[PDB]
Design a protein around this nucleic acid. Structure first.
Lengths: 187, 62, 142, 258
RNA sequence: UAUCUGGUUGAUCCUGCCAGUAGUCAUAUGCUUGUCUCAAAGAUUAAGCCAUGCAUGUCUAAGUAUAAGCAAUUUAUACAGUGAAACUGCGAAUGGCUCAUUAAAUCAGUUAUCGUUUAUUUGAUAGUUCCUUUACUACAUGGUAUAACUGUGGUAAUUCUAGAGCUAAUACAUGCUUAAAAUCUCGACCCUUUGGAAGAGAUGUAUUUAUUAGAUAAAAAAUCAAUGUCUUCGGACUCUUUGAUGAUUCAUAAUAACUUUUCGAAUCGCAUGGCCUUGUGCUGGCGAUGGUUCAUUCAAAUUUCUGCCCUAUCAACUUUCGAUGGUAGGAUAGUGGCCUACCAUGGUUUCAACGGGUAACGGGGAAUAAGGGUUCGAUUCCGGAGAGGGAGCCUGAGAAACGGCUACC
RNA sequence: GGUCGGAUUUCCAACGGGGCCUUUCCUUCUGGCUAACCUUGAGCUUGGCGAACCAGGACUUUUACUUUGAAAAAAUUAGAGUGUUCAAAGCAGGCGUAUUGCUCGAAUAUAUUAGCAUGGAAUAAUAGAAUAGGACG
RNA sequence: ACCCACUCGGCACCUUACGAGAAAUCAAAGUCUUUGGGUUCUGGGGGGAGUAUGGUCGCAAGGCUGAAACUUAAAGGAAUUG
RNA sequence: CGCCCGUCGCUAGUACCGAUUGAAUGGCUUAGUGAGGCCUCAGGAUCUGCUUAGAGAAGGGGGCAACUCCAUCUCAGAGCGGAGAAUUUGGACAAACUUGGUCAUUUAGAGGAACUAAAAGUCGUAACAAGGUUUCCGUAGGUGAACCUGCGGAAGGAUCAUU
């Protein structure tokens, strides 16, 4: 099986180590997950000590946080558009960590309307008072406004689905948002 | 696996074997004290030598 | 050292959420930590725009265990160097010693500016790489 | 070797049990428990080689199974349970209560005591932490884990316990000038009345310690064991009280008690 | 117990070696051998091949028993005694054998896990499980085999197995049943606008993500975005609370969601105890079993400094296709070139790298001695490796298992 | 000898140790201890300069060396005691009023280098402020 | 250019033998069993053998490095008398 | 009449060179084939829960007469699903084999050239005295053999000596 040690590697001087042990179970590795989109499939594997490990596959939907609002909603995923590690993962649309994807943006939109009563893109006394108090925060910024206009919003995957069965992440904002859209636009 | 029983002798052979003086003296001793074995004689001399080494390396000390 | 976000990824300190909505003083935030044992987190690390997560101060890499001192001899690597531990192994039979050296490599932050000959002490941290275990905490030259 | 050990030879078993290098080439392995392997006394070696109340492990299992015995207020019907440091054992037969403490000769003594001196014990705090749901707790040197103690109770302190519950009768903090007991090193069994200490921040907090003959020494702060305050011990102490007289002084002692 | 002797010469002094001499838990052999006690023993050559037979199975009071097994319940109509076989649960990863491998590798001392798993024991630990949450649902408790067995049997042979009929569970798949408050939302409604509002859903545990708190060198001043506490609405403003750590994004707590859904006892033996609202009502003990989390203990894996025999008739070595580092990601139980994508081109070297050899596993130790030392150390204890050579993997907490499977030789 | 060959005093002296001054700061700021308190109340009173306890801010140029300690698994080795009938061994044994029973033991030493702390500062090197980016300021 | 005296550095010399060494002999071949100022290079009985091989240099002749098997009790140094 | 050198000749041994594209053994290994498991794309025998599903027509309840209500053995047919082996794509792991290369460890061998040893072998007599041409060192040549000769060097020389 896939080893995880350096008794099969070279020393630092340039010296082939000798053959010392047989491969183990506590120095092993396993194949990547290569998590994809559509028709959620999660095979599980038994690990060292029970200690289950949800090998993600074909994951269609995931969770995404907006930290300026402190909220965290469930959403589908349009597809990945950029990965620093490999344009191949970008092309083949394989979800991993640090992964730049597009999501529906509709739950965030409708929540914004329900919470502030302030439009995006383009009543009762209690809710009116609520929105009047929650005002001065419907001014997020131009790029997110455009992305809510488009209905496809840029998020970063921060989970490890092949280890967790969970595509979780957060919407991009401001600095890294500008950095990554610049990377996309680089032509 | 059973820890092995210690064994250690109680004698020591002569350094140099054939010295007529040594042999006749220890023969006198054997023939007066009724002994059979230079083994026994060496054994007693070895005990004496052990205690004498102790005496030396003790009176060396303050 | 022209650009902190030189690489394709977005290098930063994790979890340090600089809220773009509030516009407060010190536009960007920075975590840090006193390493302990009488060490100092330098002001270049405090004011630094850099990231270098493998640093003990701004990063998340606890120093703990053995400590060593040596002189730097290499600088040709990226946030990593090699030192020389000149010491003397004793021989009881001949009752006298012999020079030996072991060139351990260490990790270095942007918090230090190191030229060759700068004597330096480090701290045992976790395995930074195949070759490395230690990280520099004080320099002793100019 | 591919998994946990199960056996134990003699001569890997510790010294202070005084197990003999003859009599079969295998030894009683202390099964896991609230105490370590080495600073622990199995009940088999206890009953079979301290009292001679039995001769063979078969007899000892008969005893443990008929339940004349009980540790921590519980029967503890295992032949190789770790009777560790300070611990209490109560025997209906003879209405005895033996306590497990050390002697200066580096051995687990046999301290005959009464039922109330059994009904309380001592325990060194090993650490303190905050459990889930905001329940502060601590854990002792005998695997006992206890909740909602005084915040004044901090690390290296010692507690005196009810033995019907794991709750506290009282506690004693660590500071300069308190009576202690030693566990580890050449000083196994000493009682030496803390005089001062030293930090060396980074490892090995050390303590300078001397018993009432002015005789001083130095020990590790995790090997010491604080038993209360200077003068009064919270328990009764064995022959010697941790003194370590000379070979010749002890020779003269026994020659007076010929 | 810091010891010498014979031998080159016709003789002498010397160098210089030889032989002699003493010992060995160092072996073999020879010749001989009456006794007591202790005891090594197919390592050296072949880690060469192996017939035959054993070497790990296992139950209580207490998981499942109608053995068409055996005693007798007669205190028991369901058994309730014992009890093969079988299901189940544990363990079979320890022991034991050998030393082939292996020369910075194991190992020995010495550090760390602020970088991780951990059955088992031991100490603590699951009011929150009705999910259109009102009929959607037994909780004095729910569903399913299936074995054993009955018999049909099939191969020359196998711890070979099919076919048909039963039946059990701590085996499987499921499953409700106990407080109180407290914030959010809504939000009926009043409408007020200083703005007041009934009523409704949530909150246990666990996983994953994002966010906040998790602290605290020193004292006054100017206001307000709007006075905020209560008002003399002149403003008095205090009150404030946070543990450990050498040091943490630590322990730990809360907001918002995620979960294909984790745990929250349908188990078992004894003893039968108390209230009367006189109901098989309600409550009750000593236990065993298992069970989420944390800690502990026996472990385990990685890890810091130092240290290894002979060789230069081995001086350049490493990097194609990982060698040195870095970023991102994957995998791992976990860090990390462990692996990949991309990138800089570095890294070790006469202070002997690298390569070769080793009748080399290492150490604790053994013989031997004035000291210094030399030699040996497979070999009873410690750590490693292996099961005919290699590779792989299932089960499991734990194996790369070999008295377990798959293949090749 | 004040004990009948034990132990004490002024002890003259030596021996090594701690401290002050001799141009000899041999880190100081915050603190509480304010300490040693100049603080004195009549002969035992009310108030001195922070390490002597401690938390820190602080300069802490580098080593080798050397001392002490913790620690270094047992067995082994040396070695205490011990009548396995002696002995090799082993760690047992011994004593009773032998009915209740009593009772010392299973020491101690060694443990290389390397690693931690550690008093020292001789010895050996070791940078220091010179077309002063020099310290006190 | 000579003489005298002195001086530093050189090639060496005469005598002693305190000292050394196995002896011849030696102003170092001394200040070494009362064993240590600093450093380099080489030898470990005689032969085999400065052979064989492998590298390496040279046109070559040959050189530098350079073993083993096997054999043997002596070879050898300095002096004495014959 | 001492000691002694070498060739040649006999006997025995040890190692070396050596054609033999020598032979074996083991290790590392390019390339190629590449099993076998494991993961992933599908697969779908098979079993199986739910939802209806209409009727061949029994039973009883009701217009008691056609007719009507529901259960019923029945069988399609339909979806809603659960598990699902054989087989299967691709991937990493990668035994073994073939072939070369390479590294070391032993080994056969016609013959050739050496060395050593061995009571009395032949040829001479090079060496030790000025050894009968003083010896030796290096180099070159010569010849049956020791060995000779030339060029330079030394004294271990047969001289420490010519004012």
């Amino acid at each position: 099986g896939i080893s995880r040690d350096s008794r099969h590697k070279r020393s630092a001087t340039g010296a082939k180590r000798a053959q010392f042990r047989k491969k183990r179970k506590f120095e092993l590795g396993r194949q990547p997950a290569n998590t994809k989109i559509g028709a959620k499939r999660i095979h599980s594997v038994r690990t060292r000590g029970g200690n289950k490990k949800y090998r993600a596959l074909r994951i269609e939907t995931g969770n995404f946080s907006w930290a300026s609002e402190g909220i965290s909603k469930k959403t589908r995923i349009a597809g990945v558009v950029y990965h620093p590690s490999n344009n191949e993962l970008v092309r083949t649309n394989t979800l991993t960590k640090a992964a730049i994807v597009q999501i529906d943006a509709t739950p965030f939109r409708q929540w914004f309307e329900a919470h502030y009563g302030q439009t995006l893109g383009k009543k009762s006394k209690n809710a009116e008072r609520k929105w009047a108090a929650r005002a001065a925060s419907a001014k997020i910024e131009s790029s997110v406004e455009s992305q809510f206009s488009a209905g496809r919003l840029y998020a970063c995957i921060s989970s490890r689905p092949g280890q967790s069965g969970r595509c979780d992440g957060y919407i991009l904002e401001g600095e890294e948002l500008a950095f990554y859209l610049r990377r996309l636009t680089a032509k | 696996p059973r820890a092995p029983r210690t064994y250690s002798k109680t004698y020591s052979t002569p350094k140099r074997p054939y010295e007529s003086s040594r042999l006749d003296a220890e023969l006198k001793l054997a023939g007066e004290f009724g002994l059979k074995n230079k083994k026994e004689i060496y054994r007693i001399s070895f005990q004496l030598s052990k205690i004498r080494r102790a005496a030396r390396d003790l009176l060396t000390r303050d | 050292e022209l650009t902190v976000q030189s690489e394709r990824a977005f290098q930063k300190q994790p979890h340090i959420f600089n809220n773009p909505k509030v516009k407060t003083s010190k536009r960007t935030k920075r975590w840090y930590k006193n390493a302990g044992l009488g060490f100092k987190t330098p002001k270049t690390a405090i004011e630094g725009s850099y990231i270098d997560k493998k640093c003990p101060f701004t990063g998340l890499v606890s120093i703990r265990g053995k400590i060593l001192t040596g002189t730097v001899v290499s600088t040709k690597m990226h946030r990593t160097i090699v030192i020389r531990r000149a010491y003397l192994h004793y021989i009881p039979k001949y009752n006298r010693y012999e020079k030996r050296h072991k060139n351990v490599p260490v990790h270095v932050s942007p918090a230090f500016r190191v030229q060759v000959g700068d004597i330096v002490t480090v701290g045992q941290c976790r395995p930074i790489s195949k070759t490395v275990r230690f990280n520099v905490v004080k320099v002793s030259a100019a | 070797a591919r998994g946990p050990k199960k056996h134990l030879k003699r001569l890997a078993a510790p010294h202070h049990w005084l197990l003999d290098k003859l009599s079969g080439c295998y030894a009683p392995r202390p099964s896991a428990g609230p105490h370590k392997l080495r600073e622990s006394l199995p009940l088999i070696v206890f009953l079979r080689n301290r009292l001679k109340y039995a001769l063979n492990g078969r007899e000892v299992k008969a005893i443990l199974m008929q339940r004349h015995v009980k540790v921590d207020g519980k029967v503890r019907t295992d032949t190789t349970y770790p009777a560790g440091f300070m611990d209490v054992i109560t025997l209906d037969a003879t209405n005895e209560n033996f306590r497990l403490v050390y002697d200066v000769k580096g051995r687990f003594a046999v301290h005959r005591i009464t039922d109330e001196e059994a009904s309380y014990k001592l325990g060194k705090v090993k650490k303190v932490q905050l459990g889930k749901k905001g329940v502060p707790y601590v854990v002792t040197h005998d695997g006992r884990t206890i909740r909602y103690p005084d915040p004044n109770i901090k690390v290296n302190d010692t507690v005196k316990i009810d033995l019907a519950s794991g709750k506290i009768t009282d506690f004693i903090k660590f500071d300069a000038g308190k009576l202690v007991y030693v566990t580890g090193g050449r000083n196994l069994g000493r009682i030496g009345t803390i005089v001062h200490k030293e930090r060396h921040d980074g490892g090995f907090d050390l303590v300078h310690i001397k018993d009432s003959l002015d005789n001083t020494f130095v020990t590790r702060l995790n090997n010491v064991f604080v038993i209360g305050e200077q003068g009064k011990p919270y328990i009764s102490l064995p022959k010697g009280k941790g003194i370590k007289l000379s070979i010749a002084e002890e020779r003269d002692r026994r020659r007076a008690q010929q």
